[PDB]
């Protein structure tokens, strides 16, 4: 019934704000609509497991907030393998490299990945982290896809594919579906290309031990009965002096303050009163989350090591199933496997099929790209279709179609209110990530406690400490990535020659 | 609390799908949100308006089960005037013209805007109204915004600015929000660009006597305490014999079968049990509805006609807050009035401003347009801010952004077990219109009638007789208009 704060979904950053607000002798209270906390996190454990993320499970360097939250709660990091050659599957064929770079050798190509990698790079800088519809062309890059500023930019097919890749792994959406300046703006927003993509050194680096279902179920244990699972919200209203919260099982909660800490969609299972103002109103129907199949196939050694394999795997094109992999073998060396994602319209195309199915066309096309028959002798199979969940909507995240965030992206985090909104997809480092949903949780918890007197204006936001277990390198170029042309730059070079 | 089957929102498709299964008798509920029933239609009364449509208003030729759907609910119609000269207003100048397409003089700009509406024609002939989704070219289509199919198309400015405002009329989104294929297919749907864009003898023709409102109204009339006001349905529970549906104040509804009349995307304000299919859970996160606000300025007299102008203005261009304006007054020359539209983008910018700013800019804007001191002198202003409706989602409908329609499209209207799908968006001919509203219902209904064994599959999609108030005269072309090049046809040929 009575408290200070109602956060409104117990994924990470729904518990990341309850925990702080807890922490400072406020009252709160978690209305979470499933019957477990984690949300877009969640960590399956069985016999034949032992342990396995089928949500959210990658951390890495420039992740502070994650690292020390789940520091503070107990857990520990173990490095992604990464020992081996990765493999750039192009064409049918398979070629072993090594650096977060998939390379060519073709001089015209390399000068085209190049430069559209740095070009990636160049435009996020003019794109601010808190306020990406004021770059100065938001309005030009936010009325074009992804799919069209790859058609300007790719001068080969090469740059292209892998671009497209590039893509649909980092949002699960595909190149067409989505704003080119959003695109720029999310990148930019984790570092940029080479942070983004990397395992070393990158986003991919580690994952928890034991999961990272841990961080959201530690906290709900020092939370003790404050957390109130089955509890969907259905109804807020904000015509009296306390805000009223209403769940579908017909409890009525009392409050001061709410946090939204659900992905913005979401909101459109809530009916308010009074109705939400006419932009976050238009704005909750036009946030889409991406389409992902994550699958684990376990088998009984990390044969693929021994091949000198890392066990990761850049899949282009459209045939293959899965585009991305990634050795998900525990740090013991033990319950070898590789996890894949199902991408964007395959994880749509290939929902049709039964698991058993997804399992032989995922061992057929490892076998193919390891070139390895042990590959097709898997001894167990896991996976998770994240576009079936009602309370998430997808994975991993919220995109924006063409238009949108220049038009409704300033009132993503405007409170309404008494309501102020957590969720990863209002964080500015590591939007659509678990350090995100931390950001975003912490900072909602913090705008509450400057309403109430409690903290000053600038205590809203507040940086964090960089982890002393996961140092960040900096992220570096050469002169020659810096400065040479692009291929329109090579002809236009050749043209003034030939004059 | 128990009943045959469960009708979720009083719009004219609820209320049109609820007469329906009324009708062969059958104990329906309408389940509706609001405390009021119309939906997207509003008629609001007063002494100053009378009446006056502040959401759906015209019904046209072609649009034969609104017309019987209202006729047989004593409704009559009126032609909305366009007896004087059309206005095209280009570069801050008004050049008056007769015919439904804004013409043009140049010999380059002719064949370009030629090209341009006959290429949205072209494209459409080979879209299923039924399923867009299986055009030959659907992927490529579908993939590709309305901006970059223009920008492909018009060759100048002039087509491109026009071409711009067509889409944003049609469809109240800005062409790099929407799909190419949606949108030649929405245009398709409709009979075509003729057809979409007249007024007489196409979509515009007509208005309510006394206002739309009156249809669902009047329905509501017939079915009396079966229509249930301030009922939002929170939950739907298909897990046992009989569907139970809730409502936010607390009711329980238990039926045999529920039909959804409600805008896609607001289905995501309902909590399912088991949870919804993964494609339909996805696709009412993907289709948004469009932004618009509706103004009406009235003035003591028509004084527009007395210039030889019928009211109609089709006004180019970034800084005018209205792009379209259709003659709003009766059909006794009375309650003089000029509807327009603030479109898409501008719905949002303008919507900061009080509403005696918006009516100053329109005034203003008049003035200029149609070259009259006059329009400075208001009598009386109405409008309404559909972006603001939390039962809505926006107005006129749901558009479709690049990639979905493909991918969701088949999802529409598939039923999910004893839930069938009505709604003006699944309809296929004039759907986002009170027409489609009413195709669809019925089509919902038969569904349900079918399912129960009371009538054959193929009485589901039922044909509807011409009216004969309102007959349709055909869409033609001239030779030159079919034959004349494109201009890089012509640059081909030099
Ligand atoms: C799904 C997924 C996500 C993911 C990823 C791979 C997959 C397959 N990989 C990631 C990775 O390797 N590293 C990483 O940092 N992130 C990765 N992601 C994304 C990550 O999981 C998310 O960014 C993060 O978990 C989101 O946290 P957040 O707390 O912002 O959001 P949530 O987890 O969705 O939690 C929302 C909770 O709210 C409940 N809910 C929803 N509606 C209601 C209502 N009406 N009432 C009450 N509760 C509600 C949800 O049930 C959920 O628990
Ligand atoms: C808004 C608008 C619409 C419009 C237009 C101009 C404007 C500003 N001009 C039109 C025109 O000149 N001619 C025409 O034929 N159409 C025009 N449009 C579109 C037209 O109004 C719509 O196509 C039509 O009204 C749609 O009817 P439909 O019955 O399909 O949909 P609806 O009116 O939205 O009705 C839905 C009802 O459902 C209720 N609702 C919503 N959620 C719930 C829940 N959860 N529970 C119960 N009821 C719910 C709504 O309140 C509504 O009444
Ligand atoms: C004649 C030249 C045609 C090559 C087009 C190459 N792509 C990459 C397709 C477009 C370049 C765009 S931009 O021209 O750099 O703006
Ligand atoms: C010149 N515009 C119309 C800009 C492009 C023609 C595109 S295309 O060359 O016909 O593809
Ligand atoms: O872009 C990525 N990786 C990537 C790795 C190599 C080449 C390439 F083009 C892309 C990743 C982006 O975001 C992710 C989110 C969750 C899990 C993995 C990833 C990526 O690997
Ligand atoms: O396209 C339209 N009209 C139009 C009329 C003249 C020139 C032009 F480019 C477009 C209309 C489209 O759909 C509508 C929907 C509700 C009300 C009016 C209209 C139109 O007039």
């Known amino acids: 019934n009575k408290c200070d704060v109602v956060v409104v979904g117990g994924g990470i950053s729904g518990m990341a704000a309850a925990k702080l607000l807890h922490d400072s002798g406020l009252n709160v209270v ?6 477990r906390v984690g949300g877009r996190t969640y960590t399956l454990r069985n016999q034949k497991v032992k342990y396995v993320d089928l949500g959210g499970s990658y951390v890495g360097p420039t992740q502070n907030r994650i690292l020390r939250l789940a520091k503070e709660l107990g857990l520990e990091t173990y490095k992604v393998n990464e020992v081996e050659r990765l493999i750039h599957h192009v064409k049918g064929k398979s070629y072993p490299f090594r650096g977060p770079f ?30 990406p519809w004021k770059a100065p062309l938001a309005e030009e890059w936010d009325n074009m896809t992804m799919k069209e500023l790859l058609d300007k930019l790719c001068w080969t097919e090469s740059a292209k594919q892998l671009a497209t890749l590039f893509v649909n792994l980092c949002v699960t959406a595909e190149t ?128 693929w090591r021994k091949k000198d394999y890392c066990g990761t795997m850049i899949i282009d094109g459209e045939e293959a199933p899965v585009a991305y992999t990634l050795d998900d073998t525990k740090p013991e060396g033990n319950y070898a496997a590789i996890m894949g994602f199902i991408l964007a319209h395959k994880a749509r195309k290939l929902a049709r099929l039964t698991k058993e199915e997804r399992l032989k066309k995922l061992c057929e096309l490892y076998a193919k ?123 236009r070079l050749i043209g003034l020659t030939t004059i």
């Open 30 to 35: 978690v209305l979470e609509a499933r019957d």
């Open 102 to 131: 998939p390379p060519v050798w073709n001089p015209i190509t390399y000068l085209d990945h190049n430069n559209f990698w740095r070009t990636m790079d160049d435009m996020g800088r003019e794109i601010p982290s808190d306020a």
């Open 176 to 303: 067409h579906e989505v704003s080119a300046l959003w695109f720029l703006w999310y990148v930019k927003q984790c570092g940029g290309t080479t942070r983004i993509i990397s395992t070393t050194n990158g986003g991919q680096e580690r994952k928890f031990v034991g999961g990272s279902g841990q961080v959201s179920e530690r906290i709900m244990d020092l939370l003790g009965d404050r957390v109130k699972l089955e509890r969907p919200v259905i109804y807020i209203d904000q015509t009296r002096e306390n805000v009223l919260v209403e769940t579908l099982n017909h409890e009525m909660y009392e409050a001061k303050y709410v946090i939204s800490a659900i992905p913005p969609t979401l909101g459109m299972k809530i009916h308010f009163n009074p109705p939400l103002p006419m932009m976050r109103n238009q704005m909750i129907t036009r946030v889409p989350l991406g389409s992902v199949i994550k699958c684990i196939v376990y088998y009984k050694e990390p044969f």
């Open 369 to 491: 790209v390891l070139g390895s028959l042990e590959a097709l002798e898997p001894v167990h199979y896991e996976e998770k279709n994240w576009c079936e969940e009602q309370y998430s909507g997808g994975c991993y995240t919220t995109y924006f179609p063409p238009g949108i965030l220049t038009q409704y992206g300033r009132v993503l985090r405007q409170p309404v209110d008494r309501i102020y909104f957590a969720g990863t997809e209002t964080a500015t480092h590591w939007s659509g990530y678990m350090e995100g949903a931390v950001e975003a949780g912490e900072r909602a918890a913090r705008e509450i406690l400057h309403a109430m007197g409690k903290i000053p204006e600038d205590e809203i936001w507040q940086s964090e400490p960089e982890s002393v277990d996961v140092p960040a390198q900096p992220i570096t170029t050469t002169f020659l990535e810096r400065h040479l042309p692009s291929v329109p730059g090579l002809l």
